[PDB]
Amino acid sequence: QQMGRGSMCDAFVGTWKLVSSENFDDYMKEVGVGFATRKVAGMAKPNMIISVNGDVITIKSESTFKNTEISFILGQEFDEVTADDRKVKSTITLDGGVLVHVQKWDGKSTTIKRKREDDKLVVECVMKGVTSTRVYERA
Numbered sequence: 001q002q003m004g005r006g007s008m009c010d011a012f013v014g015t016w017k018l019v020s021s022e023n024f025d026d027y028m029k030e031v032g033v034g035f036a037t038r039k040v041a042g043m044a045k046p047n048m049i050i051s052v053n054g055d056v057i058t059i060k061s062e063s064t065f066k067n068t069e070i071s072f073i074l075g076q077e078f079d080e081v082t083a084d085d086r087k088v089k090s091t092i093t094l095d096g097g098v099l100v101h102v103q104k105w106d107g108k109s110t111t112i113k114r115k116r117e118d119d120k121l122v123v124e125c126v127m128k129g130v131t132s133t134r135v136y137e138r139a
Ligand SMILES: C[C@@H](CC(=O)O)c1ccccc1
Pocket: 028, 061, 082, 083, 084, 112, 123, 125, 134
């Protein structure tokens, strides 16, 4: 083995903690999340751990609502069971330094964008005209 090189995706790597959320209940309603799940999911302040190993990116979410972990290769579709229990087909790509995560299920689609802004990692969740913005800081 040799030491590999870095990548632009290294700006995302680390341990992150949710510090603010805007419009998440309305986003979840648009997605179709039911009342009790929205209430409990909306309280969570997850930690998100992003790591890279070769071509494989892993995003882990640790919370009191539901732990999740996805590992993927950019551009390559995978199966994902979301925190709210949707079974979706996901594809994650880079667009000009933004990680763009599209989830497809039941003829619906939602896009989650993750971007570095100053020392933060901003997560924008979009479902048909409804956006939620979630801001993470380094843990
Ligand atoms: C993408 C996450 C939000 C986040 O990582 O802060 C999400 C999971 C399930 C339902 C709505 C949103």
